[PDB]
Amino acid sequence: NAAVIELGYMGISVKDPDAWKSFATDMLGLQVLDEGEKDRFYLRMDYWHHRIVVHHNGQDDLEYLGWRVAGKPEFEALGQKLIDAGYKIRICDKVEAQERMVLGLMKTEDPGGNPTEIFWGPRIDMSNPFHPGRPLHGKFVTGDQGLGHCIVRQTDVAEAHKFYSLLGFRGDVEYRIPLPNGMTAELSFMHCNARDHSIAFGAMPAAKRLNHLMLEYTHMEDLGYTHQQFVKNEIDIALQLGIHANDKALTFYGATPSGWLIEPGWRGATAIDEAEYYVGDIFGHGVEATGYGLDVKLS
Amino acid sequence: NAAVIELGYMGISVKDPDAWKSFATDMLGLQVLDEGEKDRFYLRMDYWHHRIVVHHNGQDDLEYLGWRVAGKPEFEALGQKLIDAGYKIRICDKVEAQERMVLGLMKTEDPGGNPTEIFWGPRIDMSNPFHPGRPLHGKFVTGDQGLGHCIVRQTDVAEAHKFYSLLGFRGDVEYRIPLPNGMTAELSFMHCNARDHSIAFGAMPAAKRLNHLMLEYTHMEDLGYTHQQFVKNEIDIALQLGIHANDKALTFYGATPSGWLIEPGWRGATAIDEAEYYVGDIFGHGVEATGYGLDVKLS
Amino acid sequence: NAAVIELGYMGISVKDPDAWKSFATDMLGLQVLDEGEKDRFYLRMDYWHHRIVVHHNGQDDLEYLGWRVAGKPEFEALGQKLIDAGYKIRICDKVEAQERMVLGLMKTEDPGGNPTEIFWGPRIDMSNPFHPGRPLHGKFVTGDQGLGHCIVRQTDVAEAHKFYSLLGFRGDVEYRIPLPNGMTAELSFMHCNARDHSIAFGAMPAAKRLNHLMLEYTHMEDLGYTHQQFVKNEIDIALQLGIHANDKALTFYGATPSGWLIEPGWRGATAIDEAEYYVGDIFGHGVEATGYGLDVKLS
Amino acid sequence: NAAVIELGYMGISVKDPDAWKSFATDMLGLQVLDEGEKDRFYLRMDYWHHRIVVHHNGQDDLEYLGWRVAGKPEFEALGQKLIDAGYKIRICDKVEAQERMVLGLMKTEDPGGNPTEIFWGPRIDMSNPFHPGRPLHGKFVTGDQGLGHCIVRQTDVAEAHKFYSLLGFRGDVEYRIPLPNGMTAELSFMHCNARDHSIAFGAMPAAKRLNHLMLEYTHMEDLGYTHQQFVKNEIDIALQLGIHANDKALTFYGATPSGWLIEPGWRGATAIDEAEYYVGDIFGHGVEATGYGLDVKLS
Amino acid sequence: NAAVIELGYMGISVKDPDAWKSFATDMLGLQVLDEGEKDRFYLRMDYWHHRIVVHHNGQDDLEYLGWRVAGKPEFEALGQKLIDAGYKIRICDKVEAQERMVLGLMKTEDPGGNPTEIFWGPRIDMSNPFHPGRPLHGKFVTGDQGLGHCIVRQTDVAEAHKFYSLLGFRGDVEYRIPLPNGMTAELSFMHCNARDHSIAFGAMPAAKRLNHLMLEYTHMEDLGYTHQQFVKNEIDIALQLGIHANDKALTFYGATPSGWLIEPGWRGATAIDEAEYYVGDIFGHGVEATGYGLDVKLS
Amino acid sequence: NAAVIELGYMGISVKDPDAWKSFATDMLGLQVLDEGEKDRFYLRMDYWHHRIVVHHNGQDDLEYLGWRVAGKPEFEALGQKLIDAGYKIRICDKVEAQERMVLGLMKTEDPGGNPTEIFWGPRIDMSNPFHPGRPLHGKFVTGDQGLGHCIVRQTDVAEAHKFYSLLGFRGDVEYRIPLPNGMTAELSFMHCNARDHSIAFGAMPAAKRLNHLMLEYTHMEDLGYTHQQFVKNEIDIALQLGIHANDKALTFYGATPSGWLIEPGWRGATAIDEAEYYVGDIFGHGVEATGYGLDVKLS
Numbered sequence A, B, C, D, E, F: 001n002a003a004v005i006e007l008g009y010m011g012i013s014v015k016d017p018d019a020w021k022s023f024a025t026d027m028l029g030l031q032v033l034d035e036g037e038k039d040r041f042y043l044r045m046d047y048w049h050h051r052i053v054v055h056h057n058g059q060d061d062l063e064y065l066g067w068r069v070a071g072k073p074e075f076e077a078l079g080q081k082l083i084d085a086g087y088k089i090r091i092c093d094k095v096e097a098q099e100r101m102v103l104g105l106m107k108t109e110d111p112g113g114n115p116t117e118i119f120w121g122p123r124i125d126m127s128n129p130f131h132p133g134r135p136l137h138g139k140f141v142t143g144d145q146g147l148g149h150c151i152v153r154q155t156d157v158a159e160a161h162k163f164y165s166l167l168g169f170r171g172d173v174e175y176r177i178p179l180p181n182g183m184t185a186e187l188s189f190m191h192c193n194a195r196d197h198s199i200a201f202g203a204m205p206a207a208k209r210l211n212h213l214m215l216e217y218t219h220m221e222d223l224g225y226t227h228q229q230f231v232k233n234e235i236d237i238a239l240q241l242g243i244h245a246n247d248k249a250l251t252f253y254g255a256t257p258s259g260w261l262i263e264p265g266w267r268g269a270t271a272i273d274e275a276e277y278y279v280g281d282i283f284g285h286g287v288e289a290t291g292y293g294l295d296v297k298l299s
Ligand SMILES: [Fe+2]
Pocket: A149, A212, A214, A263
């Protein structure tokens, strides 16, 4: 049946666009595309016109997540499914769709208050191959796996699960992390394609909608050089290099100019439909800088 | 639809835990994990926290079989299917689920009286790779094929088949073995994944719930060394090395300290949905020690 | 340069041809070919007219080993190499070559007194496919690996090595086996193609030229059924099922009607040019019947 | 022609054997084998009886490197080659060969004074599979690539190159590293098989024969866990995680109890015969702890 | 060293060119190329300008075989080899080379009197793809295997073998065929590339230089349709469909308008350097029409 | 033996460096590297520090071709080979080698007067991945095939062939092109690795040393976009898109700012050692702009 198939794009808003352009290009290798618009620019990772929209005059947080469906029949079926289950949606007119550069667009909000968009028909600029903002050994892993994954704030995990399950995602609690206070932190991870997960969440308080965004390189050499760029430029590393037990990627977590975290990574594992859980990482991800919502002992 | 996907774990109870630890490690290569609990320890075969729970103060028999489903949606669908067909089940609370180290758990009994558990979300310790209790050339075959297979006692084969069929298993009578008394022994074999079978049974009387447990090595060299360990230690071999016509594995059957049989093996064939039957083994499995419920001529 | 490329054929002489025909067909699956000759018959394993010649009125021992070279240029080069190094050879005339069914033939004796023949151009009966003397799951491993391997008697290992090295073989001591008397038994193993070895020897006394002949099945099921045939017919098994550390095949050693041993096997490893040695088997090969020159503890 | 084919074994001497046993097992995953000898024990990495001999009462440095040749013909040819070129060698008697557990042994010293042994016929314990001293996800990369690589002290690079070239190695200067004093450090790297290099050296002063030993894991997860073990145990890391431009492995450099460095690594590239050079690493290998002969800026 | 690498071209002379054009196109699928020359036309099988030259006003027999060498260095080395061994050759001038459309050409005669040419640098018309003279399912097997194979007349097999061996061919007697008169017919087969053989011969009397030419289709369907064309047109079939024991191709032998035989075939086996012989075909090749030099019982 | 293995680098001199930087980046996608030197800059195509050196104040022509050998042993052997055959060479000192950024360098001139350099040990900047001067779908084909190929001026083809043959190249006349005046233009093509050819030449008069340089893209899309860039910018196209019969690449020929031609291409075929020749292209390469030394009808 009709389901979301990838995380297609995301919009963020920032207080310092100039800092973001330098950060995205030099530290990460993303491509900056400026179409001369007064209030925004774009970041590219592949042939798509863009994967991230960076709005100016902002709040240093997530503005929207854009989830792709295969085509108009799936768009319409999913819209009606959401309406029938009691969710509030709005089908956008052509001007709004053109703003996002998509053929069809609807807007809603997830149960945690995160603005959520569902669309079909992204604009692909095959004439304009990706050209990274610094030299790269490789490129990014996108394609059928979409742009990456995020953890976002939720207030009720069961409600969030219900919503994303309706959209076609699968998954549940995969981490039960012991905390010094004696409690346990539970995090749930959900997939909609071969990427281990595309969205994840728990019930931890959070000042921002977005906890982190993970972007995946094809080559280990690019991940390593990115890590070095963070160290040389003295950018906060919240979690050191390590490998989580679910996605099995080599990754670290570092500060963006907006204060939420980017997780550059390499060698993510294929999603599995069979639920299991873990109580720690395979190695690493030790805490270094704190204050980023990830002061947990993963070992 | 919703179905059992593997034999996930099993619990046994023993009169002599010390003998079992030495047996499991030296004779078989399993890993002993002791979490300091007064009444039990664990045996590992792979990344799962455990595959076998060994309870003390016991009856030298099977305590429960734990069957895995993919996730919560399948768990709930299967529970309702069992209720609708007239079977008695109990959904366990968090304390009971935590005892088994699973995210969701229900308890029932099969038609032969064997305690049967259905669960989702096993605990996987990716941080703690399998470390066998003796040096091994290889490891065990688990993964999508679960821990192994068992033959268990039944009083009514048709009723047992009905139950396991509802759980999603497939299979029927595969062996019709001539007996000297002129009768025929019929054994049925059922699969839920690529392992040739996970559960099997006939209508033969049996003092114990468990007839045998089969564990599969990846390497022939480990099977051979295990066989040698049984011979050198003068442990009863009930059936000598041979190959059954259905699962096509090289195996032998030897006594455990509890009196039921372990069947170490190598090179099991992929399960097939097309039913057929056989009247003898390919070779071997000659009777040596008797008194173990397998005094049959397989040739 | 010119070298021997395989063990092509062998001739044996027997006191009881009728017993040998039944043994070869029923116990091993070889094909008997009788061309109506008063004093001999043939055993086939593949498309070659034959691999073993069985002479009547015999001594229950090896008569000759026939080693193949690629063609006439290699035959002539090797002959001259042997002459130059001081060995005595005789190039056979057409009648003698026709007896062996080869295009070119020379006769000599190895340093241990074993009659040795070098030939080119075997007769292949492509019109007459192998038809085993009992039903087989598979066939034999021959082709570029020749018929099998043998251990034969030698009185001076260094001299034997010199001879076989000149013929193009490679290898050296691979087993140093501790003996109860405190000594060590050293055995050397030499290859001329991908079969782990084709000829092997040590300095142990021996009543016969031939210690054993190894024949390799393509299928484990045929090895197992052969083993069962020996057990059911109460034929002496000198060494039980096991795996040697060099050739890595699953094999056992059983009595032939002539008193020397046959070693049926399966899954032999590829020969390696890098010399190493071992002090025991991987598993098995325990002594059962004694008196066959292999009363050694291989573990 | 005759050439060295791998780094087969090495001998070291230590002041604190107990510390070394704990280090090798817990920090690296090597297997300790103690044969009850008063003055030494062994470390295993694979089926070889051992790869490293650890002598007691020592100097906390390298004692010998053992280089393998394929067999006796290569051993003898290489010996004569060394003699003809003016080097001093000694062919060892059986007692000395048995000490090293090899079939043939010769002793010499390289131009830098490093004791060098050439041997054929290592002892392989196929009956005794590797069993790591801590749980491992994988195993080590050995086989045709030998045990690993080392950098050792030399006083004259041209002379060292001449010697190793005669032994069959290939390679030359691959790194020209700028130094603050305005000079350049040149390091040469030589291979004898598919491992990027087995021996390397420059003309830098050094208090010890051995600068570092590199051991390669099959799995990234084991490298990462080893790195974590060094951090958690507060063991000096001389060079942080990084990738050199020649061997292309992910590696770090850490202190051993003897004061020279171990370089655990993963994913080494295949050796190439075409010489090239580099002036920096791909990423990482930043200096952390100093005093280990590697205070160079690799970037 | 320098060797012939393929049968590149052949020249024939015919009494009836019109009949030959119809035969080659309709019966075989060859392509006729007429360059407007008064005395000859060409037959193509692939991208080469031609593979067969058909001269008018002829003798209904072979005129020359053209054997290719890789380049000028091999041409010159082979010429000198022939001169040194006592053979008479002539290096052709540019006009003669241009006649054959080659870069270098020499002319000689084999020991049986067959005009033999050795050349390098054939003309390839990549602009002019093969276009068969009738519709074909597939194409011909040429490439590294050259145009096909022939049997030609010889008066002294040993002398012929000496000559072709000098040119770089390998092979010897492969068939010993019993004849009713009690004799044996011996035929020798020699290869210079992966085609089972390119030239073959025995000592049988023959009115023509050429006994047969074999051409190989890529598709069985084309062989079958060709066979049908011979039957429907009532063209003599000398040997019915069958498979020879050496080349293992499905083939039949049919009359050409010139009276010698064409052997269309499919699925020829790869040449082997190891000599063996056979005394019959695998099946078929029964005699039908006689008078073509192949009245032998192959079974 | 010792041979050249690739076209490693080339040096050109130009009158207009600014025009060349824009041309190389925008029209071709090469990377400009400027090290701040007053008289030159570099063009990159891969990890090598550079492949082309662009000298200022120049003659708008080739300055030198740099041919790579595997290492110092090959360098020294080739030098002595050249000296023994009567050619004049000079082994360069360290300053001259450092200028070219190589470990060893010698200078000579080919028989046509083209400055020729032979070197070992290029500088590879693995830390600095290729970053094209415009967005590219793919990258360039270099690696074991070197930078590309060139046609250069010669006055005596036989002499040129002798020289390049000594260096280890293979090949001969591959094109015989009919000319309206009734003559034939012969061009010879020589390879030293898998690239169809690396150097080619005939005896046509030429105002410049360099006729053309061919650079090969991995992706057809980049070739096509480059072609479009030439059309849109109204740059002379001397030969339109087409495919030559030898190298089988899709290519066109366009003017550089220096007046000699660049041949961007895609899908070149593997070099073959077997000489053949052609009299036309497969398609295309029609003449458009004239005056570039390629006014020939290739069809
Ligand atoms: Fe993440």
